[PDB]
Amino acid sequence: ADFSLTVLRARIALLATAIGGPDYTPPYKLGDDCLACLKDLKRWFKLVDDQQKRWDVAMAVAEYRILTDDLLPILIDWENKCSLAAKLANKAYYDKIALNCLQLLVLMTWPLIVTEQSSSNQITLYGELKKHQLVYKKTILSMESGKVLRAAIRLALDVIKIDRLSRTPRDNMVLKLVLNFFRNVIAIEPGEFTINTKKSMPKKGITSIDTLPPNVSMDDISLNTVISSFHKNKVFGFLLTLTSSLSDFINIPLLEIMFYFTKDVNQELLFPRTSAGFELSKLLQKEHQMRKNVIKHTSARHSRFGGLLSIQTPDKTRLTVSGSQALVDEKIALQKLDDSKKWNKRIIKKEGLPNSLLNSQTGKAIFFTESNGKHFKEFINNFIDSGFNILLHSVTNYFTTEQDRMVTLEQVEYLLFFAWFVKYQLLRSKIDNSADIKQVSEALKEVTFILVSSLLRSAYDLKNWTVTHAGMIAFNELLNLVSRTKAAQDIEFIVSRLFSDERIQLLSNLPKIGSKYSLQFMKSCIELTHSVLKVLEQYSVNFQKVQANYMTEPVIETYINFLERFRELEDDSIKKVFSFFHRVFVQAKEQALLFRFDLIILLREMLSPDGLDRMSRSRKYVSQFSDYFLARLKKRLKKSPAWFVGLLFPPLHNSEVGFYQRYGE
């Protein structure tokens, strides 16, 4: 009962007074028995919140501001003691409270996850408890430019000094704990607005998803602040020299840190591919095209002017609409008579991991400042140039073992980590000849292919769609790299025999199921399919034997459902879809399968003035496709008036007439 809660909160408040405080003689000063008090607070975390599965101490500690107002002052001033002394060299004791402060920071910043196994109290407290971690992330990054980060690296340097031979299990743990601190500080991200669904929605939905507490802004949490404070505390230098020193107890958290940096940033944002103002002018012109389009869809006189059109149909019957512009344009009248319907078909629905490229909105960029972009890109450049192959070899040499116990989070973060840096180095090398494909050579060592294949095959068999999607992404970048090294030249021939049979079948069956899943799932299926087809064509066991496994209606449904988002897709993705159509329809000549009205509607909606950019290369491809498509449909209808009705339906799987429908003799 809540009496226990007020007793708890009272205890935590008294402990908050025991830690320390400012001294007017302003400087922060530790309390008497400070180490015992910090130990008792750590005890409270284990004793209550872990062992009873509560998070009540984790809430109370935020209420009484212990992290922001004691522990960060302690760590920053201890860092100042050690750094000022380092130029000049009872520290042997104060080092202990600094370590225990870092332990408490790792506890209070520990990434919260809620599942079915989480307690009722935990899932109740989750939403507000996340907010205090966001305050912690802000304060950790901002306070004295984040000098606590320098305190953390000093605590790590104080075991890196003693040899690889010297470091005890406690020293190894301390280094791993510092990595968990950096990982946590990166990893905190705003929570999701978790609505109760017992009671029906009112006449207005949710007012806003915003979960940030009032003293936080999303810019405080943005990657710009992380990169700035990490650069100004040389965290990047620490990580680079740490991975340079890898010659493996800590390898999983270090991998995890690189995942947590990469997980939501797009590689091409780090490359250009008055300039900002010029581009603003370009943006304004692009939306002005939409203005001159919506103007034609707008009444030239006021809304109450209200002249009535009547559409007489081809039969002796009449419809009526009020569209003032529609009086001179039956196109508008028809689509308005369609939009007038009150009816809509009812539509259908559909956690222990963070948001990422796996599930963001497809165009969701991160807006680096130029200095932060430079600092981040040079850091990951130096990482590729030093740490990639050894770290990937280290963690994959682990992960070939213990696959059965590889938790889902660990799987998805590993696959995404692999894919992101492979894609990045390919892009940097396509930009600069000075950058080497072989600097990510560990990707191609067959152990890696075997592991990623095992993860994809197992996740598909286990119907783990999350890891399935991530392994699909990893396969896309692996095949991308493989095609590049095929041009750069043996391993290409080797994998080009290993992905035979069962792997062909599995890859063929991802886009059969993909139509049921989110837009990013479908996008990754399409991307994989294009990569697979270009790889197999570069090889070209038989080409027709493989591609026939793809050319079937469930795959076409995935392609159409992906293409329904054309306004929100990128031009290159439309190009990829229409190149697939180009092969299937023009070259492979299974043209019957695309004579279906969903495509017809979609073609008109994007070729309409309300659709694609007039000067778009993808518009050029859709126009080029559509002329030939209409010509072929005209031919088939002239040869088959039955196909006027067949256009409406799935084609006939009763082969005895199905062949005739498909080809028409």
Stretch that binds other proteins, among 16-24, 152-160, 296-304, 413-421 (CB under 8 A): 296-304
663 binds other proteins (CB under 8 A): no
Residue 433 binds other proteins (CB under 8 A):
no
The reply to whether 338 sits near other proteins by the rule CB under 8 A is yes
What's the rounded Cα separation, in Å, for the pair 361 and 264?
Answer: 11
- Answer whether 155's CB lies under 8 Å from 178's CB: yes
Contact 422, 439 (CB under 8 A): no
Tokens for 467? 């890891």
273 forms part of the interface with other proteins (CB under 8 A): no
Q: Two tokens at 426? A: 């390919």
Roughly what angle, to the nearest 10 degrees, separates helices 543-550 and 519-539?
Answer: 170
Residues 461 and 468 sit within 8 Å (Cβ to Cβ): no
Q: Decide: is 627 part of the binding site for other proteins (CB under 8 A).
A: yes
Taking CB under 8 A as the criterion, the residue among 273, 341, 463, 545 binding other proteins is 341
Candidate ranges 281-289, 420-428, 441-449, 523-531; the one touching other proteins (CB under 8 A)? 281-289
Q: Which of residues 202-231 bind other proteins (CB under 8 A)?
A: 202, 204-215, 217, 219, 224
Q: Find how far residue 144's CA is from the centre of its chain.
A: 31
300 lies in the site for other proteins, by CB under 8 A: yes
**Residue carrying the six token digits 């991975």:** 243
> Which one of 287, 402, 404, 490 is in contact with other proteins (CB under 8 A)?
287
CB of 601 to other proteins, least distance (A): 7
Q: CB nearer to other proteins: give 295 or 450.
A: 295
Residue 239: CB atoms within 10 Å: 22
Is the dihedral angle over the CA atoms 160, 407, 260, 214 positive or is it negative? negative
Q: Which residue in the set 10, 36, 47, 328 belongs to the binding site for other proteins (CB under 8 A)?
A: 328
Candidate segments 238-246, 408-416, 538-546, 631-639, binder of other proteins by CB under 8 A: 631-639
Residue closer to other proteins, measured from CB, 69 or 598: 598
Q: Is 327 near other proteins (CB under 8 A)? A: yes
290 near other proteins (CB under 8 A)? no
Contact 353, 412 (CB under 8 A): yes
DSSP 121-140: HHHHHHHHHHHHHHHHHHHH
Does residue 650 interact with other proteins by CB under 8 A? yes
> CA-based angle 285:291:294, to the nearest 5?
150
Residue 520 is which amino acid? Q
Residue 505 contacts other proteins per CB under 8 A: no
Q: Select the span of 233-241, 381-389, 489-497, 653-661 touching other proteins (CB under 8 A).
A: 653-661
Does 642 interact with other proteins (rule: CB under 8 A)?
Answer: yes
Per CB under 8 A, 303 contacts other proteins: no
Asked if residue 42 lies in contact with residue 96, where contact means CB atoms within 8 angstroms, the answer is: no
Q: Is 147 or 428 the residue whose CB approaches other proteins more closely?
A: 147
- Subset of residues 361 to 380 that bind other proteins, contact rule: CB under 8 A: 361, 363-365, 367, 369
- 23 or 128: CB nearest other proteins: 128
CB closer to other proteins out of 244 and 320: 320
Kindly list the distances between the CA atom of residue 513 and the CA atoms of 60, 294, 559, in Å, as whole numbers in the listed order.
47, 38, 11
- Residue 308, CA distances (Å) to 179, 322, 326, 631 in order: 71, 5, 9, 38
Which residue, 357 or 495, has its beta carbon nearer to other proteins? 357
Phi/psi for 306 (5° steps) reads 60, 40
| Rounded distance between C-alpha atoms, residue 290 and residue 93, angstroms | 68
**Residue (62 or 104) nearer to other proteins, CB:** 62
Choice from 309, 419, 569, 584 touching other proteins (CB under 8 A): 309
> Phi/psi at 38 (nearest 5 deg)?
-60, -40
Nearest CB to other proteins, comparing residues 346 and 463? 346
Amino acid at 210: D
**β-strand 28-30 against 309-312: which pairing, if any?**
unpaired
- 251 phi and psi angles, rounded to 5 deg: -65, -35
Question: Which residue's CB is nearer to other proteins, number 332 or number 392?
Answer: 332
State the Cα–Cα distance between residues 355 and 190, nearest whole angstrom.
10
Judged by CB under 8 A, does residue 489 bind other proteins? no
- Least distance (Å) between residue 596 CB and other proteins: 8
Query: Does residue 314 belong to the site contacting other proteins (CB under 8 A)?
Result: yes
Q: Are residues 657 and 648 in contact, defined by beta-carbon separation less than 8 angstroms? A: no
- Residue from 25, 90, 247, 313 that binds other proteins (CB under 8 A)? 313
Distance CA 475, CA 469 (A): 10
- Asked whether the beta carbons of 550 and 511 are under 8 A apart, the reply is yes
Residues 141-180 as x/- pattern, contact with other proteins by CB under 8 A: -x--------------------------------------
For the CB of residue 415, give the shortest distance to other proteins in the complex, in Å.
Answer: 19
User: What φ, ψ does residue 439 adopt, rounded to 5°?
Assistant: -70, -10
Q: Which stretch binds other proteins (CB under 8 A): 166-174, 188-196, 484-492, 539-547?
A: 188-196
How far is the C-alpha of 459 from the C-alpha of 470, rounded, in Å? 10
Under a CB-based contact definition with an 8 Å cutoff, are residues 559 and 526 in contact?
yes
CB distance 606 to 622 below 8 Å: yes
> Is 567 a binder of other proteins (CB under 8 A)?
no
Q: Report the residue number, 247 or 313, with the smaller CB distance to other proteins.
A: 313
Among residues 45, 34, 115, 119, the alpha carbon closest in space to that of 71 is found at 34
Report, in Å, the least distance between residue 215 CB and other proteins: 8
Euclidean distance between CA atoms 301 and 291, whole angstroms: 17
Total site size for other proteins, rule CB under 8 A: 122
**Is residue 616 close enough to count as binding other proteins by CB under 8 A?**
no
By C-beta, is 322 or 549 nearer to other proteins?
A: 322
For other proteins, the closer of residues 217 and 505 by Cβ is 217
Site for other proteins contains 36 (CB under 8 A):
no
Is the Cβ of residue 25 or residue 654 nearer to other proteins in the bound state? Answer: 654
Minimum Å distance from CB 530 to other proteins?
Answer: 24
| Identity of the residue, 393 or 469, whose beta carbon is nearer to other proteins in the bound complex | 469
String of contacts with other proteins for each residue 88-127, x by CB under 8 A: ----------------------------x---x--xx--x
